[PDB]
With several copies, the nearest count.
Chain A
Amino acid sequence: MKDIAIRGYCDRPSVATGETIRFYVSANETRGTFDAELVRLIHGDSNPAGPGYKEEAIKSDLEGQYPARFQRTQFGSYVEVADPDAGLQPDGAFSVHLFLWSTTPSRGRQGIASRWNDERQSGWNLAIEDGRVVFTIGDGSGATSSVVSDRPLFQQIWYSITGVYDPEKKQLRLYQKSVVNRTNSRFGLVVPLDSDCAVSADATVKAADSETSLLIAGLGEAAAQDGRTWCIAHYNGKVDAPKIYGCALGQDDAEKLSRGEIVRPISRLAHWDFSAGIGLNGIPTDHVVDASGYGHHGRCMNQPSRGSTGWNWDGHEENFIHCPEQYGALWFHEDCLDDCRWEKDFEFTVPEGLKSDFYAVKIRYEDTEDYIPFFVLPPRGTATAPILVIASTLSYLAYANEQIMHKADIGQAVAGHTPVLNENDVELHKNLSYYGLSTYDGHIDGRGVQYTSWRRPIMNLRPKHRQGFGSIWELPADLHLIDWLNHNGFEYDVATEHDLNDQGAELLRRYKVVLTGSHPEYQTWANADAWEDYLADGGRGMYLAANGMYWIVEVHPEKPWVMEVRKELGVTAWEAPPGEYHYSTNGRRGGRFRGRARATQKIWGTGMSSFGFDHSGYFVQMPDSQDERVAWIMEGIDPEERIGDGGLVGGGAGGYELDRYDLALGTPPNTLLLASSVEHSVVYTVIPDDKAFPHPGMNGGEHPFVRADITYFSTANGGGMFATSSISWLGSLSWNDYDNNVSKMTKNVLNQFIKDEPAPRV
């Protein structure tokens, strides 16, 4: 069909004046040129019942023609130990020990530990071939020598594997031993497992210098060109404590290494401890320490999961910062990606007279037309507007390259209909290697994706994209608010949640009112602190969304383009495995905000109540609508009207996500309840956070928790928070050509908050 022929991304989400942003572009093949120009995004939704797509051209130094070329992506987690001087290719006898835990032991050939060239079969490796651990040496002639284990591995069982090369006997040996205990494996000690072997073979050849790096969980593709080794046969599952010896080990040495004893410490050529670097702040680094004392330090590539349960993990401690000796594993999936690592094609330095708004680079290739969005800040330390719009870039990363309808069996069940998918949803399915996975997707192992990255082509971030749950989801849903603010005469600035994480409440206090996106679901702990500190002293805000502070996020300290989330039972897609709840960026718990005594009620007045994606409802006015203290809100609205019966997103104003009033979760006591939503269906459900025992009938129309709630409270020093508690509020702003109750209410509150008089103090 209309296939995607050009891809691209930018290196950073937001850029102030006088700063450089770099744009990395890739084509299907190296031919032709492509065009590029700068646009200002105004509206994104191409629904014929609305305004249609809107953009504006901007003259810049950025535009021109550039050569189109294919750029290759490395895809899959591994550890790369750079060995320039062939020290880890030993000249005589050498032994390799490691602990293993395989999740897909029959998914092709999977290299475990290797200094191995695979173009010419030179070096040594340790790999899984047809479910069996194989230890192979070679010398580049094509002639190799292997030893194959008698016992095929089981899935998710800890094994202790030793490979031995011995020239004195001209012999390859292999030791295998399962080290199951009560908690570390898939099944426990009641199973009479027999997976111990000790096999030998005749090494007719000698191992040669492979001219590659050493790789944990992979094999090297060819000889290194310009110092880069390419990884090919990716392993899935935990590796714990690998080490290389300069001698040949016996069976008593293998038996002692299976119990965790370090035998012959003077003979270790290398020993990588994956738990070295854990303090009370976690392990926020890609650095892998050589514990032998020879400086063969490694580097984690494409972010394998650190702080993972080891081979000796009994469950007496479930926090990896208090028992680092039982957390020496790294998970290593084959479909991870933290950086595409492409070569830059062009870059942009922001001029002085460039307004702070949403921007995109429009790349015009042969028939494919691609966008690359970015965000432009005001000059550093200054504000150029009274209104601040927060772009929800952390939630853009959470839903980045989302593949629910192609992967999740409950995709159509959460929706209330069959999904409608673009060619972008076909392009993600056809080329998974170019893009990666979302945090709502899982790996090929089964565990969900914790880490997501900005430095990759994110295809559901383009403004002409329409998502599968309904109409539109993340950035075109914020272009609704942008188009409403441009149709009226409001002057605004744009910040991101990464900028909020960097700058604190000092960013927010430059503005009289701060607005959120349509779905600001993922926040850091410092963003919640900044919002609370802003509102506690005269700050005003509008929360024009639902599901607004649900999951705790930490931005990675060494790599600020990578986001971490670990999830638990709640409104979730996956659940974290039992001892692995704590983040590795900071050493803290970080599940739901509500489970850390920081529910969304304690800051924004309302918080997560229900979800469902068939259609939307409308709001019905509560008795606080006729209160004299909120006559400024309900100003041009008859007291018997439906608020928001019609809209682009879902067909109404109350829908897709609902937040409610709750004093026990932390609503301020002076909050008024202006309206509440009705006409919700069986597809909407009560969230698992609110259930004790699941009984029948906890769904829309049949349970009191299924509602959205328009609220308002006031804070000290003339501040106040307004909330509408629905995603599809912003999709109802441009209904009936901007002549509706939704835009009247939002405009009344926004004209009140941009004044100099205090917020009206309910």
Chain B
Amino acid sequence: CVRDPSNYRDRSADWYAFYDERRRKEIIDIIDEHPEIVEEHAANPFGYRKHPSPYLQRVHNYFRMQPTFGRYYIYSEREWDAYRIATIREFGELPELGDERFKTEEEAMHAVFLRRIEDVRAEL
């Protein structure tokens, strides 16, 4: 007999947690086994005329498909002059901006990459 919807829940979240744990462990093991992909990303974060390595691309494929609440992006404060790092909040909320400013946007992309690696190291 099914009568109250608060007695039930989405039980795929019990597997999404289990999946995220294995996946974060795999990503920090890739970043520890191949330290050169961080400098590869720092040289060219777009892969312009030098396409990224498969391990760097696997790290990108983890970082880019996350849920948007809590996701980092780059806020063009003054375009081609200053760039900051923002964090997405709910509808109706201004984002939380970062302290550091950046000259080009490639520097900001690499700082977002480093801060995401720090945040995945912090949870483990």
Size class of the contact patch on chain A: 35 or more
- Name the B residues within 8 Å of A58 (CB-CB): none
A412-430 residues at the B interface, CB under 8 angstroms: 412-413, 415-422, 426, 429-430
- Name the A residues within 8 Å of B77 (CB-CB): 1
B18 touches A430 (CB 8 A): no
A704 touches B16 (CB 8 A): yes
A661 touches B11 (CB 8 A): yes
A615 at the interface (CB under 8 A from B): yes
Report how far A203 CA is from B16 CA in the complex, Å: 49
Q: Which of A194, A406, A615, A661 contacts B3 (CB 8 A)?
A: A194
B35-61 residues at the A interface, CB under 8 angstroms: 45-49, 51-52, 57-58, 60-61
A430 touches B94 (CB 8 A): yes
How many A-B Cβ pairs are below 8 Å?
161
B114 CB to nearest chain A CB (Å) = 12
Q: What mask results when residues 609 to 640 of chain A are scored 1 for a CB within 8 Å of chain B, else 0?
A: 00000110000101110000000000000000
A466 touches B75 (CB 8 A): no
Stretch at the interface among A149-157, A290-298, A473-481: A149-157
- Name the A residues within 8 Å of B1 (CB-CB): 192, 194, 716
B83 CB to nearest chain A CB (Å) = 7
Stretch at the interface among A61-69, A492-500, A515-523, A666-674: A666-674
Q: What mask results when residues 149 to 189 of chain A are scored 1 for a CB within 8 Å of chain B, else 0?
A: 00111110000000000000000000000000000000000
- Name the A residues within 8 Å of B28 (CB-CB): none
B64 touches A695 (CB 8 A): yes
B14 touches A702 (CB 8 A): no
B54 CB to nearest chain A CB (Å) = 9
Stretch at the interface among A74-82, A526-534, A589-597, A676-684: A676-684
B4 touches A152 (CB 8 A): yes
- Name the B residues within 8 Å of A662 (CB-CB): 12
A696 touches B57 (CB 8 A): yes
- Name the A residues within 8 Å of B65 (CB-CB): 409-410, 412-413, 695, 697, 703
A46-69 residues at the B interface, CB under 8 angstroms: 46-48
B91 touches A661 (CB 8 A): no
A411 at the interface (CB under 8 A from B): yes
Q: What mask results when residues 596 to 616 of chain A are scored 1 for a CB within 8 Å of chain B, else 0?
A: 000000000000000000110
B53 CB to nearest chain A CB (Å) = 11
Q: Which of B15, B26, B49, B94 contacts A1 (CB 8 A)?
A: B94
B77 CB to nearest chain A CB (Å) = 7
Q: Which of A48, A623, A670, A707 contacts B8 (CB 8 A)?
A: A670
B46 touches A416 (CB 8 A): yes
B24 CB to nearest chain A CB (Å) = 13
- Name the A residues within 8 Å of B83 (CB-CB): 420
Q: What mask results when residues 69 to 83 of chain B are scored 1 for a CB within 8 Å of chain A, else 0?
A: 001111111011001
A463 at the interface (CB under 8 A from B): no
A1-56 residues at the B interface, CB under 8 angstroms: 1, 46-48
Contact flag A417-B11 (CB < 8 Å), given A406-B68, A432-B91: no
A673 touches B12 (CB 8 A): yes
Q: Which of A48, A152, A614, A681 contacts B80 (CB 8 A)?
A: A48
A138 at the interface (CB under 8 A from B): no
B59 CB to nearest chain A CB (Å) = 10
B109 touches A418 (CB 8 A): yes
- Name the B residues within 8 Å of A323 (CB-CB): none
* Most B CB within 10 A of own CB, among A408, A412, A421, A430: A412
Contact flag A194-B2 (CB < 8 Å), given A466-B79, A624-B14, A673-B12: yes
B98 CB to nearest chain A CB (Å) = 13
A696 touches B61 (CB 8 A): yes
- Name the B residues within 8 Å of A704 (CB-CB): 15-16, 19
B3 touches A670 (CB 8 A): no
Q: What mask results when residues 173 to 213 of chain A are scored 1 for a CB within 8 Å of chain B, else 0?
A: 00000000000000000011111000000000000000000
B123 at the interface (CB under 8 A from A): no
B10 at the interface (CB under 8 A from A): yes
- Name the A residues within 8 Å of B97 (CB-CB): 1
Contact flag A195-B3 (CB < 8 Å), given A408-B68, A411-B68, A682-B57: yes
B72 touches A418 (CB 8 A): yes
- Name the A residues within 8 Å of B32 (CB-CB): none
Residue of B nearest to A191 (CB): B2
B76 CB to nearest chain A CB (Å) = 5
A152 touches B61 (CB 8 A): no
A473 CB to nearest chain B CB (Å) = 15
Q: What mask results when residues 384 to 420 of chain A are scored 1 for a CB within 8 Å of chain B, else 0?
A: 0000000000000000000001111111110111111
B47 touches A407 (CB 8 A): no
B112 at the interface (CB under 8 A from A): yes
A409 touches B12 (CB 8 A): no
Contact flag A663-B74 (CB < 8 Å), given A429-B91, A615-B47: no
B48 touches A651 (CB 8 A): yes
Contact flag A681-B61 (CB < 8 Å), given A418-B109, A466-B76: no
A405 touches B11 (CB 8 A): no
Q: Which of A661, A668, A670, A681 contacts B47 (CB 8 A)?
A: A681
Q: Which of B2, B63, B67, B92 contacts A192 (CB 8 A)?
A: B2
- Name the B residues within 8 Å of A679 (CB-CB): 49
Q: Which of A410, A422, A615, A702 contacts B76 (CB 8 A)?
A: A422
A701 at the interface (CB under 8 A from B): yes
- Name the B residues within 8 Å of A152 (CB-CB): 4-6
Residue of A nearest to B22 (CB): A678
A663 touches B18 (CB 8 A): no
A421 touches B86 (CB 8 A): yes
A701 touches B3 (CB 8 A): no
Contact flag A426-B105 (CB < 8 Å), given A194-B2, A669-B5, A695-B65: no
Q: Which of B18, B66, B73 contacts A409 (CB 8 A)?
A: B66
Q: Which of A154, A651, A673 contacts B14 (CB 8 A)?
A: A673
Q: A153-B5, A413-B65 are in contact. List 10 more A-B contacts (CB 8 A).
A: A1-B97, A151-B4, A152-B6, A411-B68, A418-B74, A430-B93, A663-B10, A676-B18, A696-B61, A697-B57
Interface residues of B (CB under 8 A from A): 1-6, 8, 10-12, 14-16, 18-19, 22, 26, 45-49, 51-52, 57-58, 60-68, 71-77, 79-80, 83, 86, 88, 91-95, 97, 105, 108-109, 112
A-B contact pairs, 24 of them (CB 8 A): A1-B77, A48-B80, A153-B5, A405-B68, A406-B88, A409-B66, A413-B65, A416-B46, A420-B105, A429-B88, A429-B91, A432-B92, A466-B79, A614-B46, A615-B49, A624-B14, A662-B12, A670-B2, A671-B11, A679-B49, A682-B52, A695-B64, A696-B61, A702-B58
